[PDB]
Amino acid sequence: MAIYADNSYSIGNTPLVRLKHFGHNGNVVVKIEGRNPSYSVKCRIGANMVWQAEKDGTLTKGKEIVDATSGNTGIALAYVAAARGYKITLTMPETMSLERKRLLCGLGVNLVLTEGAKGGAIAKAEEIVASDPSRYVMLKQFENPANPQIHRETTGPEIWKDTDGKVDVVVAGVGTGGSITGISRAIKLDFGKQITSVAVEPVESPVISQTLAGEEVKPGPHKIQGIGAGFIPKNLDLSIIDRVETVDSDTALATARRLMAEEGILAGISSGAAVAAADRLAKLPEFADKLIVVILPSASERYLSTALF
Amino acid sequence: FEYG
Numbered sequence: 001m002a003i004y005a006d007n008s009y010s011i012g013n014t015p016l017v018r019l020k021h022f023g024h025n026g027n028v029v030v031k032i033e034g035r036n037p038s039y040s041v042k043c044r045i046g047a048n049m050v051w052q053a054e055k056d057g058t059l060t061k062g063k064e065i066v067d068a069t070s071g072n073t074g075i076a077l078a079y080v081a082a083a084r085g086y087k088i089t090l091t092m093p094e095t096m097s098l099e100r101k102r103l104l105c106g107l108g109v110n111l112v113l114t115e116g117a118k119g120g121a122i123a124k125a126e127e128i129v130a131s132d133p134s135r136y137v138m139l140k141q142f143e144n145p146a147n148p149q150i151h152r153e154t155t156g157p158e159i160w161k162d163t164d165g166k167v168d169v170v171v172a173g174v175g176t177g178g179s180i181t182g183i184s185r186a187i188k189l190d191f192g193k194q195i196t197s198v199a200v201e202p203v204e205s206p207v208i209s210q211t212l213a214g215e216e217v218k219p220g221p222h223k224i225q226g227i228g229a230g231f232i233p234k235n236l237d238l239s240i241i242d243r244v245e246t247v248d249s250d251t252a253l254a255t256a257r258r259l260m261a262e263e264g265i266l267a268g269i270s271s272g273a274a275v276a277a278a279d280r281l282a283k284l285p286e287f288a289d290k291l292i293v294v295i296l297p298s299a300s301e302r303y304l305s306t307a308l309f
Numbered sequence: 310f311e312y313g
């Protein structure tokens with residue numbers, strides 16, 4: 001029967017909701033990844049990175065997990081570690097919301113946080129696994145192929161299924177790049193439909209836009225938690241990206257607030273950025289009758305400590 | 310927020 005053996009197996013099957021105050025006559029639909037265990041899209045890769053490491057034998061009983069996170073991946077790995085019986089240590093920038101810090105400790109993580117100015121998180125972590133290489137396993141979400149793979153296997157197929165194959169555009173903020181990569185691979189390659197894959201990054205740190213334009217790559221600070229890593233991650237397949245949209249922090253925050261107040265959707269800051277980007281495309285006659293699906297990575301209550309509220 |  002439909003009873004999951006632990007909480008890691010209950011990932012996904014998140015709903016699509018049509019927006020009423022964005023887009024043009026309902027052409028913008030949002031995928032609410034806040035409806036997940038640990039309540040972000042990252043639960044998917046928290047699960048699959050652990051499952052994969054188990055299956056190639058890098059993760060065994062007694063081995064301790066390590067990775068670097070801006071929060072949600074950390075919370076995701078923590079619920080999976082707790083559910084499946086692993087010890088776990090994580091690194092994070094000091095500047096991430098208190099909520100992230102708060103429940104990571106409740107989930108029983110040995111927590112380790114780094115200089116906010118350095119973003120830095122990736123650095124010490126590696127320095128930590130070196131301490132006893134067969135004690136610790138680093139899962140490395142920015143380059144681990146188990147990250148986009150679970151999106152190719154679940155998130156993309158769900159989108160295809162729930163839109164009855166009518167999806168024309170996928171809009172997703174880029175952090176690790178796993179979401180837009182896996183989803184795009186599923187729909188374009190597995191189901192065969194030539195959609196428009198749209199990456200979203202902060203205008204303050206538009207390193208994807210700069211790279212593709214062959215300009216000076218200049219990362220910068222921003223408030224859009226979860227995206228804008230300030231470099232091109234290995235798990236972002238540039239070859240499958242058709243378009244890059246930049247969004248500023250203010251507009252991202254205002255849009256998240258609008259999602260709450262006008263749509264009754266409890267979205268996080270990066271969800272506001274993705275919808276703002278989607279709304280701009282949706283109001284181009286060229287997309288005015290395409291079906292645009294927007295990933296909403298996380299939920300509101302994870303950001304009560306931030307500018308969102 | 311920056312690198313990571």
Ligand SMILES: Cc1ncc(COP(=O)(O)O)c(C=O)c1O
Binds near residue numbers: 174175225227270
């Ligand atoms: C809140 C939030 N938004 C957006 C993203 C970007 O998702 P991805 O890493 O698949 O690019 C993340 C990544 O964890 C996130 O935590």
Ligand SMILES: CC(=O)OC[C@H](N)C(=O)O
Binds near residue numbers: 071073313
């Ligand atoms: C790019 C970023 O901000 O972090 C990666 C991912 N959001 C995490 O949960 O760690």
